[PDB]
Design a protein around this nucleic acid. Structure first.
Lengths: 81, 60, 119, 101, 135, 50
RNA sequence: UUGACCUCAAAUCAGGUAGGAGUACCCGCUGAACUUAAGCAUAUCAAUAAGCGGAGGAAAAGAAACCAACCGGGAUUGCCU
RNA sequence: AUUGGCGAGAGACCGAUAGCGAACAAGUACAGUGAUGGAAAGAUGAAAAGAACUUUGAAAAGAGAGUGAAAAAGUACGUG
RNA sequence: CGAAUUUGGGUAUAGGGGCGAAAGACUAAUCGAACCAUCUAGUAGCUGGUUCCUGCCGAAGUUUCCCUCAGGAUAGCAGAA
RNA sequence: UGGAGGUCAGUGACGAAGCCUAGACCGUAAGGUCGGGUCGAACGGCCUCUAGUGCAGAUCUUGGUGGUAGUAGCAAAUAUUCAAAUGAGAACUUUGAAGACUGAAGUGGGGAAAGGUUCCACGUCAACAGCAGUUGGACGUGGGUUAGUCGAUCCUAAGAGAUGGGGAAGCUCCGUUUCAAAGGCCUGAUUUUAUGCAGGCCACCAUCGAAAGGGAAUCCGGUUAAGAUUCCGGAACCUGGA
RNA sequence: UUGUGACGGCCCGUGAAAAUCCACAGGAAGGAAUAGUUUUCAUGCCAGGUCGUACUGAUAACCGCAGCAGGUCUCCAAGGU
RNA sequence: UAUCUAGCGAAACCACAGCCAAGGGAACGGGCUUGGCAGAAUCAGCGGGGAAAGAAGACCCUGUUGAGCUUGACUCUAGUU
RNA sequence: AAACUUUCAACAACGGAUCUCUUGGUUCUCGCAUCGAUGAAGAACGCAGCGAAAUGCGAUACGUAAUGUGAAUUGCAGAAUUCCGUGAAUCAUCGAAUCUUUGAACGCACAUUGCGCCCCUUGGUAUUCCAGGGGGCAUGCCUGUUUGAGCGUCAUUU
């Protein structure tokens, strides 16, 4: 049959983790990530995928530099002490 | 038996044990403990006592 | 307690290196103690002291290289301003204020007058 | 309503040739100087079966006229050509079986 | 012309959009030449271009580019305007001479569709302007 | 598998370290509503499928 | 024999710059169909959705190869009409 | 111009099946190879003062107590 | 049941496309055109539902036209002012 | 009915809203008011304004709950029994004694993919193991994976894929040696220099692609709660260097 | 049972590459009584980094919603009839 | 196995429910009318009935609803000449 | 007049409705202009005396430096002689730093924690071999420096 025996037969990963995003969406044979588009220069995004943009947009991580750039501008990008 | 960092290799472990404990090690073997931390077994030469070194370090 | 940055600055570079190595030794001993004992924050205290010594050494080295590069253009990129990429690409004040001789003569001859209407 | 077999053959993904066991392209040697101004003597050294082709191929060896080294060529074997045989390629070669006049 | 990049000429729609072959690009060959040259020399700013030659297959143009980070151009106040950042990829935005010609930016009754921007104008005349006290 | 890569080994190490019940003193911290580890995993129940 | 000029190179040469993120707005390219026409093909949806390239705090436009036909007005933009 | 970013002031708006999917460890748990899909889940009490102690039971718990204005507030807790 | 054999792994072929010793078969339980998101709250003369009370008045299934015959307009019947 | 502007200087912790009540009164009715219980913080009448304003249905949505009903059923894989121990409690745990089966293309001993700690020890039965459980692949806490010789790493196959270059408005496409100026190691001059040098030759003309192809080299014995061709003891070998 | 060897049969089917390692042609250069030629003879010295390594591998550790009579590649294989 | 016990324990379906004959009725009633009758609670079977359950009949028709395919339908189109 | 439906001046259940509340959303208005090769956004690992998640951070790791305030943090411990002070703080501000592996991601590759080359230093009786520490090596373009190639072409004889 095409159901339970076939699901038993299926055991070979076609996607693995991608370097750009740890999403388990890097196609091994295609050598491309189905989620972020790695190794393409631009991150995969689509205007019809608004939920995906919201999932993987700015502010969903650590913001390790912008979170302070805001205050740096507020202070005027000063130098010294 | 020491817990060591991933970035270190056998040469660096040999050198570090030599510098810290002032002992010559005969061999160094390493594994990556599945909690995710390198584990090093270092065997000193016959002219040193591992128990003596461990007691000097502080753990009996 | 924890060492303090002002006496760290007063002390010299050899003293700083020796203090750092003693702090690392004390960290190792205290960490063996932590392995053998339930709980103790002296390890956090020692880590803080090590961080203080390291930042004092770093700041003194950066001040030394800054004084080495003082007065000359082409400073190392770790020493120049980190304001913003766009701001750095933007024109300097002199460049923006630069005007042609024609416009300079025009502005000199015919500036904006401070007139008023009363009577 | 759907693309047909020859149309798929032209795209040729599973319709390419199985070329693993072939012994190389069967071509005559280049026409530089000796083949058009005289003749060059080569030794047909081996006769083998080219997979996918009904004719045997001949590994022949010539001397490079410009540098000290041997040049191996893949000829299509004519009937009666045997191993270790002098074949001759050029304008002034003799009319014999295997020659490249 | 610009052949529509559809497989086997299939568009899957009305005949008007089913036409494939004789469609024309809406920007000029000057415009695409400047765009390609700027994409190559992305560190430069495209100022203008001109036709120099043409054959059956090719049209040849020469495009002038200005170095926005050259110190003379930072100075020499006649060109700090192009040193300014609002002029990044003028050829991509269509701000060059041929770009504005293709956009149709001209004063007059013949350019009522594209005088302040075609899409901006269309938006302006397609908004429903409702006030607090309805007029 | 027995023949893994270091990335997969690191992922399994992180999963093993995370797979523990929450400490009982975070239950006692004031203005806290956490009662259990809601992100708890079992190898039979949920496969991380890395 | 030795110097140039032009064109084209090579350098872990000296110093710089571009990429990428981001769509709320802006400048373009490309571009449908559902739908309406009580059917449907022009038409409509729509010079829109999707896709692509490119900026700024606004962008674009902008000082007439303009509008006019009047006793003429006088860059551009926006609102009421 | 302004459904983005930063800061601020408001409303004849909604009030935990409503309002953003998300008032809460919410783009989380979870599903799919993948694109992607995507929840549920607020309230003890002013204050834990969160039930010492005796007894039955192997124990969980029960009975009696005790705290509390209320235990017709006892983790399974506002009303129910 | 020694082979046009069986099979693991690595590869290539991607949707009006692939692949098919050909059954419209197979293409991740989906195939006479996969799956995902968006256009899209697609359209529906066609089904189903359409949430308090009382009082007063109170019908039509007929005329004409319509790709009109399960529908509309029109006139007629009814209410209100 | 939810909100808003007025007024009742309206009701209320001496109890508002809400909910229950074959208790009462009023209206033809939509409903309103009150009596009695529970409850603890807001709420109402009148004149107006306003709307996301009234449910019995839509194989309506979400959630919860019934009869069926202690019902169908828990019947494939030959099969269990006696005693003791532990335990609150044993058909199921452990030990012994029997009886059996798999019968070496095994119900044995290892491995690949996959899983990821499920391995092991000690506590331990709230939930899971569709009966039970003292047991467990369950829960809690910890321990455990040791290599020059085994693999990866190296090579290339099918194939993938930058560069030069050419298309495409463009995301990107073709192309892999082609219409490219495509380039690194030896006795080395022996001392301030220096893969600049009195010197030398070529022609694969990136890279990725196999834990089953190719391939440098380790065996025995012992050892643990768990690791061993990896640890220990002995005995060897290969590569690189000196 | 496994390995090996010398062989025979089969094909219009004749049953990868490359890395790597040797050897052979040729004679460049160098070499002589306490001084030179051999580290492809023997012995002697040092080092050999990084990641995996536990366990199951299936009527309970994988997939099939599960401790599912399903599916899932392979090595060793005693005695009697 | 069913059956009876100990333990465990669902689902389909359900306007309300469940005895008939005739009548009339949307022309085949469990309910309405006339008559026959009619006594708790139940167990195992059983397959006449519940026009039993499973699914907004797939046969047929309508829709100014599609789609697969064909062609000498209408209008176009890649390619080619 | 037993067991088996209806209703409670009645409790106890199941369940989470109503009511009341709200550090939350949703709309409106106003002000401002600030990402990234000086390496962004986003990932992956790790960092706390007791942390799994969330917050923050990067081997200086729930943070270091500087400034301000002034005596805490608190779930339990821990140094309270720091508490008339160059000084607590899960404080605020924030200008100096640190910033692991990545990522436009940059020595080449990447289902490798794989494989190189250059410079300096140290060790192994070593310029070549190995190891350790530190600094580097992407591409497309612009200006300039040096080294070049082309009977492309001038000055036109040993």
């Amino acid at each position: 049959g095409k159901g339970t025996p076939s699901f038993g037969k299926r055991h070979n990963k076609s996607h693995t983790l991608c370097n750009r995003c740890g999403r388990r969406s890097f196609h091994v044979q295609k050598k491309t990530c189905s989620s972020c588009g790695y190794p393409a220069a631009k991150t995969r995004s689509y205007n019809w995928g608004a939920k995906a943009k919201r999932r993987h947009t700015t502010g969903t991580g650590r913001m390790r530099y912008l979170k302070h750039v805001s205050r740096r501008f507020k202070n005027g990008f000063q130098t010294g002490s | 038996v020491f817990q060591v960092s991933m970035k270190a290799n056998k040469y660096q472990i040999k050198k570090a044990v030599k510098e810290l404990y002032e002992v010559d090690v005969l061999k160094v073997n390493t594994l990556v403990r599945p909690n995710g931390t390198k584990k090093a077994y270092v065997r000193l030469t016959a002219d040193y006592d591992a128990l003596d070194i461990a007691n000097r370090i502080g753990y009996i | 307690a924890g060492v303090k940055a002002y006496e760290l600055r007063t002390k010299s570079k050899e003293q700083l290196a020796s203090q750092l190595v003693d702090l690392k030794k004390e960290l190792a001993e205290l960490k063996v103690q932590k392995l053998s004992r339930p709980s103790l924050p002296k390890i956090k205290t020692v880590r803080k002291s090590i961080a203080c010594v390291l930042t004092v050494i770093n700041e003194q080295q950066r001040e030394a290289v800054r004084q080495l590069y003082k007065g000359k253009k082409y400073q190392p990129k770790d020493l120049r301003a980190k304001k913003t990429r766009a701001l750095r690409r933007a024109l300097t004040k002199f460049e923006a204020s630069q005007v042609t001789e024609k416009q300079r003569k025009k502005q000199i001859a015919f500036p904006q007058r401070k007139y008023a209407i009363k009577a | 309503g759907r693309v047909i077999r020859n149309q798929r053959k032209g795209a040729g993904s599973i319709f390419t040739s199985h070329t693993r066991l072939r012994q190389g392209a069967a071509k005559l040697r280049t026409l530089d100087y000796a083949e058009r101004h005289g003749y060059i003597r080569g030794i047909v050294k081996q006769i083998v079966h080219d997979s996918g082709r009904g004719a045997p191929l001949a590994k022949v060896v010539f001397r490079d006229p410009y540098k000290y080294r041997l040049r191996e060529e893949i000829f299509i074997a004519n009937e009666g050509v045997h191993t270790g045989q002098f074949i001759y390629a050029g304008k002034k070669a003799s009319l014999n079986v295997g020659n490249v006049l | 012309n610009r052949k529509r990049p559809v497989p086997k000429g299939a568009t899957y729609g009305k005949p008007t959009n089913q036409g494939v072959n004789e469609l024309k690009y809406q920007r000029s060959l000057r415009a695409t030449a400047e765009e390609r040259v700027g994409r190559r020399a992305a560190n430069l700013r495209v100022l203008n271009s001109y036709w120099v030659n043409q054959d059956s297959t090719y049209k040849y143009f020469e495009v002038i580019l200005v170095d926005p980070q050259h110190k003379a151009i930072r100075r020499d106040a006649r060109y700090n305007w192009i040193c300014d950042p609002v002029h990044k990829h003028r050829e991509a935005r269509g701000l060059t001479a041929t770009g504005k010609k293709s956009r149709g930016i001209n004063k007059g009754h013949k350019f009522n569709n594209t005088k302040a921007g075609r899409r901006k104008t269309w938006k302006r005349q397609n908004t429903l302007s409702l006030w607090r006290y309805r007029k | 598998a027995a023949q893994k890569s270091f990335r997969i080994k690191q992922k399994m190490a992180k999963a093993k370290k995370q797979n523990r019940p929450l400490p009982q003193w975070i239950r006692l911290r004031t203005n806290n509503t956490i009662r259990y580890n809601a992100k708890r995993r079992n190898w039979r129940r949920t496969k991380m499928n890395i």
